Amino acid sequence: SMTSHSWLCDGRLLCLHDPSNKNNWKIFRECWKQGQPVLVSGVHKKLKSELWKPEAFSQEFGDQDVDLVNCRNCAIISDVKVRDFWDGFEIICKRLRSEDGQPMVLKLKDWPPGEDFRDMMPTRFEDLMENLPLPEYTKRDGRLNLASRLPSYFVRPDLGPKMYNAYGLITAEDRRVGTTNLHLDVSDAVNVMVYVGIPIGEGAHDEEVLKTIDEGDADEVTKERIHDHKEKPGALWHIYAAKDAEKIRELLRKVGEEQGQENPPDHDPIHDQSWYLDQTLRKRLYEEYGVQGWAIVQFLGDAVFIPAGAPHQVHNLYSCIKVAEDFVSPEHVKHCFRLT
Numbered sequence: 001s002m003t004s005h006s007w008l009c010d011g012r013l014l015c016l017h018d019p020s021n022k023n024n025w026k027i028f029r030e031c032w033k034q035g036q037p038v039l040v041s042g043v044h045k046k047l048k049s050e051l052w053k054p055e056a057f058s059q060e061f062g063d064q065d066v067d068l069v070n071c072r073n074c075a076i077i078s079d080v081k082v083r084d085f086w087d088g089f090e091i092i093c094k095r096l097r098s099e100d101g102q103p104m105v106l107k108l109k110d111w112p113p114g115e116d117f118r119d120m121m122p123t124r125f126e127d128l129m130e131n132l133p134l135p136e137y138t139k140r141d142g143r144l145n146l147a148s149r150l151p152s153y154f155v156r157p158d159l160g161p162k163m164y165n166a167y168g169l170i171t172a173e174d175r176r177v178g179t180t181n182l183h184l185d186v187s188d189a190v191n192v193m194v195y196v197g198i199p200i201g202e203g204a205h206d207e208e209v210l211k212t213i214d215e216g217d218a219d220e221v222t223k224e225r226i227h228d229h230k231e232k233p234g235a236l237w238h239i240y241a242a243k244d245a246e247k248i249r250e251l252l253r254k255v256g257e258e259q260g261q262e263n264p265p266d267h268d269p270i271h272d273q274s275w276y277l278d279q280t281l282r283k284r285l286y287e288e289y290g291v292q293g294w295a296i297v298q299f300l301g302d303a304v305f306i307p308a309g310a311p312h313q314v315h316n317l318y319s320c321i322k323v324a325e326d327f328v329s330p331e332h333v334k335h336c337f338r339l340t
């Protein structure tokens with residue numbers, strides 16, 4: 001029946017069911033003040049779906065010059081046309097190929113660039129901003145968003161939103177690699193999955209997705225969203241509490257040294273954004289440091305709320321279009337303060 005909310009991660013993650021429900025703040029407040037991430041489903045049903053297709057991005061902006069990253073080896077592909085990315089989004093045989101002759105898993109880097117989203121795409125901006133959940137926290141002029149209200153003693157976020165576009169990771173070896181490596185942000189963020197592209201040509205890649213989710217350490221209720229409701233899964237997230245950041249640094253310093261890296265003892269492997277925590281490193285983090293995270297599968301229309309200071313990483317299961325907005329909640333303002 002109509003339910004206001006449910007729990008995922010064996011009770012540890014709030015999942016709100018109606019993104020426009022004026023009472024969401026009452027349940028959200030409590031979980032958010034404890035430094036938890038939150039998931040809101042059903043945002044895709046609020047959007048104009050014709051504005052968020054790969055084909056329309058290709059047609060309208062195809063001639064713009066961009067760089068891409070090879071997600072498998074971190075190689076940068078320099079000064080190509082953005083249509084070279086979009087036209088292989090879903091059709092595998094159209095994708096740029098590596099020396100080995102295999103179609104590459106690519107991320108479109110920094111597009112639209114800097115703070116240009118609103119200028120380049122005024123109709124998309126309107127469609128997203130008008131349908132963000134928890135609007136008092138997430139809108140530019142929201143009463144509980146301090147972004148526009150803080151003095152220079154605070155690190156203020158850029159004007160957004162930002163778009164995150166990348167292919168899905170495919171093989172058994174791709175399971176140990178990230179779309180976005182482990183990092184943290186000094187402000188809060190909401191990340192919405194506006195489109196999930198399920199590719200064709202090698203269109204029998206269903207079972208590898210399920211083994212990645214399973215090995216990802218995803219909860220039984222999350223697996224029921226696929227098998228029962230036939231929802232489209234986009235990305236596997238791992239998020240850790242802000243207060244566990246330094247323990248994670250201690251693990252990654254030790255593993256670095258083990259792997260022959262020669263780093264100063266105070267260097268910051270989270271700020272380096274060079275690590276993905278695979279099943280081996282997540283197990284080790286649990287056993288040797290007593291740190292546990294949230295394994296979150298972001299489906300089409302799912303909004304992921306990321307607390308300020310929380311280390312997080314992303315692994316695309318299929319090809320994803322994501323749009324993210326920064327904000328500064330009073331709950332977490334400490335994380336962007338320039339003193340002590």
Ligand SMILES: COc1ccc(C(=O)NCC(N)=O)cc1
Pocket residue numbers: 009010012217218219240241292293294295296
């Ligand atoms: C910050 O400490 C914790 C401790 C435990 C969890 C948890 O139950 N995770 C389950 C899952 N499937 O991801 C989340 C956070």
Ligand SMILES: [Cl-]
Pocket residue numbers: 035242309331332
């Ligand atoms: Cl906090």
Ligand SMILES: [Cl-]
Pocket residue numbers: 120121122123124125
């Ligand atoms: Cl537009």
Ligand SMILES: [Cl-]
Pocket residue numbers: 025133134135136137
């Ligand atoms: Cl609100």
Ligand SMILES: [Cl-]
Pocket residue numbers: 179180181273
């Ligand atoms: Cl990255």
Ligand SMILES: [Mn+2]
Pocket residue numbers: 183184185
């Ligand atoms: Mn981020």
